[PDB]
From a paper:
Here we determined the cryo-electron microscopy structure of the Mycobacterium smegmatis hydrogenase Huc and investigated its mechanism. Huc is a highly efficient oxygen-insensitive enzyme that couples oxidation of atmospheric H2 to the hydrogenation of the respiratory electron carrier menaquinone. Huc uses narrow hydrophobic gas channels to selectively bind atmospheric H2 at the expense of O2, and 3 [3Fe–4S] clusters modulate the properties of the enzyme so that atmospheric H2 oxidation is energetically feasible. The Huc catalytic subunits form an octameric 833 kDa complex around a membrane-associated stalk, which transports and reduces menaquinone 94 Å from the membrane.
Because of the flexibility exhibited by this complex, we performed 3D reconstruction of the individual Huc lobe from two datasets, obtaining resolutions of 1.52 Å and 1.67 Å. Density maps and the fourth coordinating residue of the 3 iron–sulfur clusters of HucS indicate they all have a [3Fe–4S] configuration. The redox properties of the Huc proximal and medial clusters may be further modified by an unusual d-isomer of histidine, indicated by the cryo-EM maps, at position 166 of HucL. In Huc, His166 also interacts with the proximal cluster, but the d-isomeric configuration shifts the position of the backbone carbonyl of His166 so that it interacts with a highly coordinated ligand in proximity to the medial cluster. We were unable to identify this ligand, although its elongated density suggests that it is not water, and it may have a role in tuning the redox potential of the medial [3Fe–4S] cluster. Although the narrow hydrophobic gas channels greatly kinetically favour H2 diffusion over O2, Fourier transform infrared (FTIR) spectroscopy analysis and the cryo-EM structure indicate that the active site of Huc isolated in ambient air is in an oxidized state with a bridging hydroxide ligand. The head group of menaquinone is stabilized by hydrogen bonding between its oxygen groups and the terminal hydroxyl of Tyr301 and the backbone carbonyl of Lys212, as well as π–π interactions with Tyr229 of HucS. Concordantly, analysis of the hydrophobic gas channels of Huc that provide H2 access to the active site indicates that they are markedly narrower than those of structurally characterized O2-sensitive and O2-tolerant [[name]] hydrogenases.
Residue numbers in the entry:
A (entry chain B), C (entry chain D): 2 to 323
B (entry chain A), D (entry chain C): 4 to 516
The structure:
């Protein structure tokens, strides 16, 4: 299947994360899984008119385009012209319009493409938006009703960056005849990865269960959960990040970094406003302003209170010891 | 002949190169960074630590370097204490990201152009095609596949790569365990053995680092079959055969902000004490002379950039005020890249080439302290054959063995019982300067914190130094001058332009942020 | 450092698990980390008298023996003679006596060597025992006071089998000068791996937190925690199994198999008596007979009751979906 | 000359081989399994599902096979329903364990003996040393390292390998997701490409499977450089050069219990319906004739085994009553291995060689159904050159490409929306027969459940079939006869004995359990 990978308001993190893919690695995926990577800004051999010829053929339908992967935001500034992102002689948004409409499948890889991501934070100088979402609001650049030629919406592979498996395993499924096994949530994210939470498989959930808080970074992360003092969004973030470990090693939360909720459309949450970075917003200094998904403050706090009293001794000591 | 190459890919972002070719040689060049996100604008008014999240998103390949300097900007701004272990972890992860970038860029972004038909007549062309062909090259596949290993070490300490923010004022968020360090060593050793030594060098890292002169490098290639047929040895022979040593020279003046602090010398990060604590030494090499880097001499000009401004700005007072490209081009502006310039005495504000080559020249500067990189190899190469696509590349690949050894030692240096983080005071006020050597060169953050908010946040990336457009004096940026003099055998496929731009490992997402 | 790896009442699972090692792999560990693997039953080139010469040199002190790795039980039957395990012309126990006393470090890899493991279950026909433990009781075959020449007790790398990292990372630490960073718990297990629980990082802890039970195997494991109906011992088992994933992929509990507590000295717990296999022993059908480590039934049940009432809807639905 | 080899390692457990050598040729051989754990004894009175935990611990390398048949013993005992997906997962994981065993055993346990000095005069010896030298062999390192990949697939579905018990009556515990299957395919494809095709075969699995005759195999070796210099092609040429095709013939009679049920044909496992549902066909090849396997014809003799008993026992009524080796040796007993024998009409209770070769002959039997392995290759090899160390090995390595394709298809066959488990009725009563083809051959469990307890649990492992001692009629076990006729160039280093014993991939921990 032909794959065209374009970068708009991108940092290429999803490409680099994609290149870290293992089982399959990127090379085997490109070569050994029938996925003809027509071009990629970071990997495509063609340049200049030679590259443009590939793009136009896909855009105009001269050659089939099975999967259009878009990384980065759709940059519409200035004044909706998209000239803050000029690619191959056109505003990148114009390429997105043609290629997304010519593609059998459109995959938004990374928050930028999915929802707007970091470039879409206020004041959004680049007029950035996602392909089919602007943050949580559906519609993005292509509109809510956009469907690829196979009738699917933009497949949103979120993350900042997306984990390689979140895209490669989808590509393998498409290449191995399992496109029908791919179910998408309301944000068009593959449920096989985004029905879990970042907290799912986190090494600190036991501390979270007993409301034992990581109090400090570094050696302080040898114990406790990052929810209460570092604003970890794991319980409110859908991701396999602690099920499918990053780089096959770890995750933010395992390493002691709070989940930033980067698989969720609002990322960066609160637009990294003062006091919201690596801090848990609280009411009266005790009640987190945001509770885990599906929970209410009353029951969560009541359960949290009971959990503290029942907290075992080990939950209050270092567990990730040398 | 006026030739406009759009897109010039494999430069991590959107690059359009315009050149004026006369008799097959580029006489003038314009580098057009065509994508803008305005992270500096976004960071205004944000949490002082928002750079730790945002700046890595400037770039996927070098985001950890952004994190490294973004954290150190806060460390200096907030006068934090940096436990030695945290410095080691930052150094390890910074180097590991670069160790990942070196093969990934070389095979995926640069070497595939060695299969260009312009070299079809070379006796080594077939071998180059077998090795460096995209996605099937016998050297391409393992080099790219194994390039993920160093950033596994990054992920061990940072949780993931790309997209960690685990370097925070006061140290790192993580608390590495014994298995983390042992696994990191094992990953590094495996990567060094499998790619760096077996594939790239065909010999030990120690053997390559015994090369102190260009003649040593040449003798190293011919010393034995393994080094001769190593990717490095083949690359050197291929470059000398196809002429990649003949062009891409560039400015010949270099900026290295350095990175990899000695833990004992940067426990309390300051702007003034930065240079002395560096292992990978900072240094400005201009007009054949060595100068000590001073961030105060950095200015960004936007005369030919799509930004408002009439005079160069030091990034502390720098501004990122976009102008519409349509209007900017009417004013002669042609790039979203600012034009960083360095005030070298006697030369004024001059473009400086950033990158591994800049570091190698800085490492050749005299008066190196014991903890500091002291390597005369590229001073000799620079004097012997001068800069070029090949020499610039060799500087990049020379750091693989060099950084590997540093990382391997830093992992040993870790004292796992000691602190990785000192709780800093999140001062509502502070000016911070964080700089590092991303894989592509000098990466610097100037942050101004006021009212517990980001008042100003200016990022100068290595490729902005290199690919930044002409300054107010119409002085071409380092890549633009490197492009000038580049032969163009085929105007339809101007690979030589790609070689030069990619020899800098140009990252356009970094260039503009 | 010279390594001699012997198998007593072993199944070689720890060797095979060891051979699955990655970062480092076994070959790099044997060759590239200065660890001279003198012999191994599954890998040693030598056989017959040639192999015996290596063993005797280590046993008699002719050549240095830095690390003596013992896999499998010390078989003492019949009647303490050990002839149910004859190796290289001697009862294996006799080799253990000489080599353990001649070794700078003695590593028991696997429950069999650590504590007796499966062969030590009643009626224990082979008279199996661990090197320094018999189940939880310290002393095993070598005695409680046994110390290697470096003053360390038998380093117990438990598991059935041990994960490769539990041994290789220790070997790397020894080879890289980090022997001093190795801290052992009361069972001589490396705390860097065995301060966590199997539940630490389990993908079902959220279900455990909200006391949502996996009700059936197969597709039933797409939700819930295995503690309540399948006797998962994760909360009572010290292991990194869900921190350092097995085969770099998963763990028992992530895959839907209850933790059997195979890093704990009592494994197999209850000697696999009827009703104790893949079942949670309960009192009155509601109260688990064993609660998580550090917890008491009263507070656990009280917290469990509160958790059920506060349980969010997602905790009651499939999360590990296709 | 009476030679006692102790230990004969790389046979997954403790093996001592005694041989009588006359004029450099073994005339008699005794295989002594020297380690006993008594899992069958331990399983008595235990939970009916205790075998799912205990039996895998019979062996690390083939424990999943133990789990596979242990689960099917319960499935038959409890008349369970096996959802097709569960059968697929069991088949995939059983094959994946075998796919891991094939390279791991070949390089780590068997091939290193090809570097024995007895072959120093071979023109291929130096290449054999470079490839198969322990821990440094250019083929040894990747083959062993990559042998972990198939069991990563096992771990994806079973949580871990070794030491999963995820195959339970009614199906499997696991609920594979899409990423599990796609990753499993990717791992399998990577392993097949990197080791099986590039290293072992030097060609596609399809090309190797086109070999239907011994001459095809020989032509395949010489067809091109890649296959000629592949580990397979080199191994064949090395065997023919050093004489590994000249000895190790063995009994020439084979037992294959088969495994890999077709999901639609074994949804309700029964002893009677087992053979028809097998993909890897069961079959007894004796006296040049094909027989249908019947577990009722299996008997275990302990006349020369360290167990009490006077007559062969069918494992349903089998007993594992140890006798002290000191007393047993006074009675002529010399092994902890029982002596499994199969009642072949006209031949009585005869030893049958189990293993890949046995499967290959079974696959050559006529009347193969569409889902069944129909491969005449080793019927032709058997008739052309007969069994040997080489032919036995080739049968093992022939299953790599064959099983890979099966696993690759089974992964496709998985219907991830469908059931992986049917809650069985844990009947207090039941007799179950679970059998599979572990990497080493016919692995069988006979379980008797009474009063919700394990009343009897008898395990017959493939190496017990092969390495089991003489029966009451003094008929040598398959490995003992294979050892007979083996040349012994060096009595101090009787590598030929290792070749023969290791050609069976002998697993002594399995042998005795
Ligand atoms: C209310 C509350 C208190 C904690 O201490 C705590 C600690 C760790 C995670 C969460 C929490 C929490 O929600
Ligand atoms: C008492 C109790 C009830 C549950 O439903 C439950 C579900 C999942 C894990 C644990 C439990 C538990 O301990
Ligand atoms: N390396 C790198 Fe990226 C650029 N240019 C930064 O900083
Ligand atoms: N394969 C294998 Fe092990 C033996 N023999 C079993 O069953
Ligand atoms: S990784 Fe980069 S491309 Fe966008 S989604 Fe994150 S900023
Ligand atoms: S359990 Fe983990 S995902 Fe965050 S909320 Fe606590 S650190
Ligand atoms: S920030 Fe993103 S990468 Fe995972 S740990 Fe949180 S969802
Ligand atoms: S893997 Fe085997 S060696 Fe013992 S510890 Fe478990 S039975
Ligand atoms: S959280 Fe996991 S470790 Fe067991 S007890 Fe529940 S399945
Ligand atoms: S059975 Fe053992 S392997 Fe881990 S999941 Fe439980 S401690
Ligand atoms: Mg800037
Ligand atoms: Mg038996
Ligand atoms: O970059
Ligand atoms: O085995």
């Amino acid at each position: 299947a032909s794959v065209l990978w374009f970068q708009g308001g991108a940092c290429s993190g999803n490409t680099m994360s994609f290149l870290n893919a293992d089982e399959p690695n990127v090379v085997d995926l490109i070569v050994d899984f029938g996925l003809d990577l027509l071009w990629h800004p970071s990997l495509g051999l063609e340049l200049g008119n030679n590259a443009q010829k590939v793009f136009w053929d896909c855009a105009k339908g001269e050659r089939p385009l099975d999967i259009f992967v878009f990384e980065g935001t759709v940059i519409e500034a200035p004044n909706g012209t998209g000239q803050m992102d000029m690619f191959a002689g056109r505003p990148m948004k114009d390429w997105v319009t043609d290629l997304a409409g010519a593609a059998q499948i459109v995959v938004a890889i990374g928050d930028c493409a999915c929802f707007g991501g970091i470039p879409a934070m206020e004041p959004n100088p680049s007029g950035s938006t996602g392909l089919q979402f602007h943050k949580r609001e559906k519609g993005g650049f292509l509109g809510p009703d956009f469907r690829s030629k196979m009738g699917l919406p933009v497949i949103n592979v979120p993350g900042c960056p997306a984990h390689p498996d979140w895209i490669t395993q989808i590509l393998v499924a498409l290449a191995t005849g399992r496109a029908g096994d791919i179910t998408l949530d309301d944000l068009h994210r593959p449920e096989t990865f985004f029905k879990t939470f970042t907290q799912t498989g986190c090494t600190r959930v036991q501390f979270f269960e007993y409301k034992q808080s990581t109090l400090s970074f570094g050696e302080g992360t040898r114990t406790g959960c990052l929810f209460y003092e570092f604003g970890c969004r794991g319980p409110m973030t859908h991701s396999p990040c602690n099920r499918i470990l990053w780089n096959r090693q770890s995750s933010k939360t395992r390493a002691g970094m709070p989940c930033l909720g980067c698989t969720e459309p609002e990322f960066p949450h609160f637009d990294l406003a003062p006091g919201t970075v690596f801090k848990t917003q609280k009411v009266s200094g005790m009640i987190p302003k945001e509770v885990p998904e599906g929970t209410d403050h009353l029951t969560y706090m009541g359960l949290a209170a009971a959990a503290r009293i029942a907290a075992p001794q080990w939950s209050k000591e270092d567990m990730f010891v040398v | 002949l006026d030739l406009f190459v759009s897109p010039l890919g494999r430069v991590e972002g959107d690059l359009d190169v315009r050149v004026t070719i006369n008799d097959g040689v580029v006489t003038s060049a314009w580098t057009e960074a065509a994508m803008f996100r305005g992270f500096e604008i976004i960071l205004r008014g944000k949490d002082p630590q928002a750079g730790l999240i945002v700046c890595p998103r400037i770039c996927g390949i070098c985001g950890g370097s952004h994190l490294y300097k973004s954290a150190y900007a806060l460390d200096t701004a907030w006068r934090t204490h940096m436990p030695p272990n945290a410095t080691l972890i930052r150094n390890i992860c910074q180097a590991c990201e670069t160790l990942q970038s070196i093969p990934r860029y070389f095979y995926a972004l640069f070497a595939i152009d060695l299969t260009n038909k312009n070299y079809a007549k070379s006796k080594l062309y077939d071998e180059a095609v077998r090795r460096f062909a995209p996605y099937v090259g016998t050297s391409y596949q393992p080099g790219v596949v194994l390039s993920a290993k160093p950033v596994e070490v990054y992920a061990i300490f940072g949780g993931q790569w790309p997209x960690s923010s685990f370097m925070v004022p006061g140290g790192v968020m993580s608390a590495p365990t014994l298995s983390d360090v042992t696994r990191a060593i094992a990953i590094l050793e495996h990567w060094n053995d499998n790619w760096l030594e077996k594939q790239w060098l065909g010999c030990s890292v120690d053997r390559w680092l015994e090369n102190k002169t260009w003649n040593d490098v040449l003798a190293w290639v011919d010393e034995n079959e393994s080094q001769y047929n190593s990717d490095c040895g083949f690359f050197i022979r291929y470059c000398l055969d196809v002429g990649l040593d003949k062009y891409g020279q560039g400015v010949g003046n270099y900026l290295a902000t350095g990175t990899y602090f000695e833990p004992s010398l940067y426990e309390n990060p300051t702007i003034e004490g930065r240079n002395a604590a560096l292992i990978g030494r900072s240094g400005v090499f201009a007009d054949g002379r060595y100068f000590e880097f001073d961030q105060a001499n950095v200015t960004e000009d936007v005369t030919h950039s799509f930004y408002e401004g009439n005079r160069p700005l030091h990034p502390f007072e720098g501004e990122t005020i976009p102008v519409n490209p349509e209007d900017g081009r009417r004013q002669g502006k042609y790039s979203w890249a600012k034009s960083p310039r360095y005030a070298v005495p006697g030369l004024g504000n001059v473009p400086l080439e950033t990158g591994p080559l800049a570091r190698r020249m800085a490492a050749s500067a005299p008066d190196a302290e014991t903890h500091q990189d002291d390597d005369p190899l590229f001073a000799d190469i620079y004097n012997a054959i001068g800069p070029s696509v090949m020499v610039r590349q060799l500087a990049r690949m020379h750091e693989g063995p060099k950084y590997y050894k540093w990382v391997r030692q830093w992992l040993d240096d870790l004292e796992l019982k000691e602190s990785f983080y000192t709780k800093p005071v999140e001062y509502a006020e502070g000016k911070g300067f964080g700089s590092t050597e991303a894989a592509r060169g000098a990466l610097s953050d100037w942050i101004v914190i006021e009212d517990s908010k980001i008042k100003n946040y200016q990022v100068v990336t290595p490729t902005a130094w290199n690919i930044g457009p002409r300054d107010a004096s119409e002085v071409l940026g380092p890549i633009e001058q490197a492009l000038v003099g580049s032969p163009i055998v085929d105007a339809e496929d101007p690979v030589e332009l790609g070689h030069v731009a990619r020899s800098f490992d140009s990252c356009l997402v970094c260039t503009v942020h």
